[PDB]
Symmetry: D2
Subunit: 394 residues, 4 copies
């Protein structure tokens, strides 16, 4: 055992790594190009469905490759992120619901557990790609209204929806207003071919350009009541939901560790490929980034193996297993968010001006790595309130 994301543990996830080794070269070459143009790798991504990677994190009995170990899921995303961060960010959207649904299928009410099968089995081979329309657009509030006959209409617009260009389904997060007066939080599942559904291609960002992070709108989209994932009212949320949120995006830390590892390999390979005796300041730099890189992988490594031990073991309190997971997660995120772009910055100043050229890969990495600091949960501003609140009373 090592705990640094060097190699997967579960034999189920060991099959996902080698199957990916065959698509790595093919996507590592197109990385620079797709980033320049900003075009999602449709054909490079659909090749996953052929192998079955598009269906990992799905029960063996539902399709194949029963991956549930969060630590391995991240070890995979890191191997891929080393090639292209952008595709890795997208593949996560899929692998994400993979775990979300597998938990909804086993521990969910009959009405919602039935539709879980349908989707989980469909993305097993790759016939359906699922996405999540979570965050609302500045000034908008996705909501559900009744029409009269018994059906509902979904209006609103979600932003930052990754992997969207290839998507067949969406997990919209709306909020229906009850006549009682309270506002309930429900998360429908709209098909791509939904009538009011319009996907926009306005994703122009500093990095992660190759991912499909589009804004998607819904205009009076129909959806029978029989297909809603109604939850508890807004506001009064229990810390038990934190376990769900953790498992959802904790594996992304692997991709940032991936970008870092990537930058190092470049900068170190260029510095060693200089020959002779390395300059004084350079030895200090290489020593420093190597250290930060290790601390970085180790931290996210332990944070993962901790979410796994608390995911399928503790059967005591539902709120405790929520903090026990979200906290160390946030500690690792807090670390990677300052420690990852910290090593690429040294790798940058280690290779020199040639690495400032848009043509150089170390330039791209310098933009892709700053993505993590903006991802929820939690932002620095938020993470500080959260972590200090746990360290104290509040």
């Amino acid at each position: 055992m090592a705990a640094d994301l060097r190699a997967p543990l579960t034999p189920a996830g060991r099959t996902v790594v080698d199957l990916l080794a065959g698509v790595i070269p093919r996507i590592s070459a197109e990385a620079a190009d797709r980033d320049r143009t900003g075009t999602f790798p449709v054909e490079a991504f659909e090749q996953f469905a052929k192998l079955g990677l598009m269906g990992a994190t799905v029960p063996a009995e539902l399709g194949g490759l029963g991956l549930t170990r969060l630590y391995d899921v991240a070890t995979a995303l890191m191997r891929l992120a080393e090639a292209d961060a952008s595709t890795a960010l997208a593949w996560h959207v899929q692998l994400s619901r993979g775990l979300t649904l597998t938990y909804e299928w086993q521990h969910g009410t009959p009405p919602v557990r039935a539709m879980a099968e349908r989707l989980l089995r469909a993305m097993a081979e790759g016939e359906a790609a699922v996405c999540g329309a979570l965050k609302d657009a500045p000034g908008v509030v996705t909501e559900l209204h009744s029409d009269g006959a018994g059906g509902w209409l979904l209006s609103g617009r979600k932003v930052l929806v990754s992997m969207a260009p290839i998507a067949t389904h969406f997990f919209v997060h709306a909020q229906r207003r009850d006549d009682d007066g309270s506002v309930f939080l429900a998360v429908p599942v709209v098909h791509r071919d939904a009538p009011g559904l319009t996907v926009l291609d306005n994703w122009d960002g500093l990095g992660m350009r190759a991912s499909g992070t589009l804004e998607v709108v819904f205009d009076r989209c129909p959806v029978r009541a029989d297909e809603l994932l109604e939850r508890g009212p807004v506001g009064a949320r229990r810390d038990a939901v934190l376990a769900g949120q953790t498992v959802s995006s904790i594996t992304m830390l692997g991709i940032y560790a991936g970008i870092a590892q990537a930058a190092r390999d470049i900068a170190v390979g260029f510095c060693a490929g200089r020959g002779g005796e390395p300059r004084a300041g350079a030895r200090a730099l290489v020593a420093g980034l190597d250290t930060r890189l290790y601390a970085l992988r180790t931290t996210v490594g332990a944070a993962l193996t901790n979410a796994d031990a608390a995911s399928v073991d503790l059967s005591g309190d539902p709120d405790e297993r929520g903090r026990r997971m979200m906290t160390p997660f946030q500690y690792a995120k807090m670390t990677v968010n300052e420690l990852a772009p910290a090593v690429v910055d040294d790798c940058l100043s280690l290779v020199g001006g040639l690495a400032y050229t848009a043509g150089h890969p170390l330039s791209r990495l310098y933009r892709d790595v700053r993505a993590g600091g903006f991802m929820q949960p939690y932002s620095y501003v938020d993470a500080v309130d959260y972590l200090s609140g746990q360290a104290l009373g509040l």
Copy 2:
């Protein structure tokens, strides 16, 4: 009287600041556009020749606006950098030789002091734009230059060819002179940082054989010390944005946000103050030439490198907080805070000196060597 790049001192440089205030708005608007396309501001730049800014740092008796105070030259570049870092980087190339030549004209041999006139007076109105082809391309050793800012609107190139070192001044209209606009770099896209690939013995300005003395360090310092003002400018710029966005949120600011804003404001001040003192120090040592020529070289280059070392980690440090303070909207290529995040990292690659080099230099002065 503060020393934090607030306002210029010399009345000569106080005239350059207000004359620039009229071109700021026009260029601050096209900043986002020129960066996206990557097109040098030809017409926005030639408007300087019309006012005379293209001729600042040139003796009043040769053309106008006799600016020699390095501290004000930087205060100017900062005001401009707040608008667009790229144009500021370019305008520096011009203002650079401005000081290089004025020193060559007053303290130079008759053969080379005569041609100093011809060029210094020509760029006084803006008839001629001077550039410096210093760094050689990888593999090739002049005997093609890369990283030459403000090349598209050039007229004169001061190449560094060589074993004796000599710098001949070629012209744009030369028979074997080609300028390639193949510049594609992370930040500073709107500058003319392009690459370029006959002359008699009376046009060459021979120099010492190539190893060197410490007196040359004074020249190198005055050449690019004023660029620190542009990075301080980028930082100040990012702050104004991030703080204006945070304050424009209303109500009570979050806990972590107050920590961020307090921190970047601190770093920003340390940053401006340091480059501020490093400048006023190069000016006090620039006017005294009756002492050792090698001492006035270290006394200038050292504090310069301390400020550079500071700004290189402290400037991109404030824009990174300004970035994490505004949120994801600042990650959009459309947002200005995104551009600044790329423009700021330019300084760490500029010679002299790089971190790797600056470390050997600074430790060598702190010890024996």
Copy 3:
């Protein structure tokens, strides 16, 4: 022409620097000893009164050495801090009121401007050493109660009072509880020999051991009817100018401890001979940079408080214009100073971990600044963010 605490500017302060050069050696030798025992330098300090340094920052027409330039006052404390931080911390207490009173004597009401003479002229030669009993003790309130006859009784204790042992007069901050219902804030001046006054020799810290930072209690101290100030709670930003000038010059002593540690560590590294190791060059380059940034920042912050100090023509603006850049410098030196001594420590090696080595003492003396008000990190953050935004 510098702005890095290299040399004083005003000719008045140029006289204080060379007069101090003669006492430096004497005190730099006893530094290690007084720190180990924790004994205030009484005789080493009284030698200042002989020369007149104990009376600097006092009008030439009141005693001598008319030092008003805050930048030079700090340049002095840095020269001294390089010898012993502890004595420098104490000498500041005196130099402090020096500026406080000089401003009270020129711009103060007749009742309080008269007693300003009596004290300012007395400490001119060194006949009287003034102190400030500001911060109250945890859970204690220093107030003034009425006895009836007309006099007032002062009870309560103060802590963090440097320069206590040699001290003669105390400027204790107390508050009176009016009958109307609102409480007023007053700063009486009581003489060491006060009837109920007691000074405890209870100081025992990490660093600054040699300073006279003692706790002084006041149990029923009489006093005739006191520098009256406005009611607590509603304090304007104009008071910030006063508070700045009070302890902004201490930044010089921390810059001093840093400069000190460097000289040691670099002198030891250079005295090794041959070729310096890779990591060492990185260290020395780094601390030299931080040291420069450090001196420059506190340098500019000072020259800015001086430019805003002489121009009395908004009283609230001149308060923020001074306190803010001050806090920026403090914020910088508080993380940048102990930052250079830590590299000087890891540059000399284990021998610098020995209590016998001076680099060990400096490592403890430097951490003092982060606890000094105003403002603490916690406080400084609320202050600085409040100025950067609306609030």
Copy 4:
């Protein structure tokens, strides 16, 4: 699973942790006192021999408590360091040879493997306390021996000494030597309560029967002092508990800057424990599960060790500094425990191997060719 030093793994080391829980209170109270005076805890330390902790890291077949898992050895030192860093530093000297000898006893030549059983079995109950005189005094260089060693922790209660002389040999002198004198002149900034004394050797009588470098020796050096990282993680964890307990014990709503501080130190603390945690579990996997190259198992262990050391050396005193500025001036008083911790934490940066200056040449040399 976790790997952050939370709790030991091997059942052998789980018995050392609870046995220590009984001596913790007793030593945690005298910590402040012994530090102020600078007096080694003789009676507090021998109480270990009574229980058997003085004999941990010794084969069950030789005495008892067969602890070989480096990760648990550090988890132990951290539990103890949280009480007093100084005693933990000393107890490490003992536990150190524990692993060094157990490896010498199993994989050593007959002549030296025989004397291994002698000493290993003697310190099993606590009859003999072993020390290491490695470093040599500045200016002097160590049948018939001379020289003088320093930074010898746990000197006072020592009986045997493993000095480092050269012709490179590691003789074994007893405490009752004829030309052996131990000087208790240790006056440091921190870790004053440990037995780090300066011992001299004036022509010592010893028989010859009792007696460039490859990278395989790096494995030995790693296992020797890698477990000390646990004590620094311990000092950090300690300072946090104090500062956070004081901040939370303030009540109401915490100030803005304070929330930033507590969030920051908690993060650094986690990164710190996790890193040294992984570095340990890595030295254990390379310590027993390997029969391959002897030089590879040397770098594979020493490198991640140095990464963790590099991290804890800047990250540990980093959290106590925030805990310091979080509690305020009261924590600057010599009376406050947070003051002591601020001095004890800076010890790690001076310990070999490797120093920052050295660690940089080492780590860059592995990252490149050299």
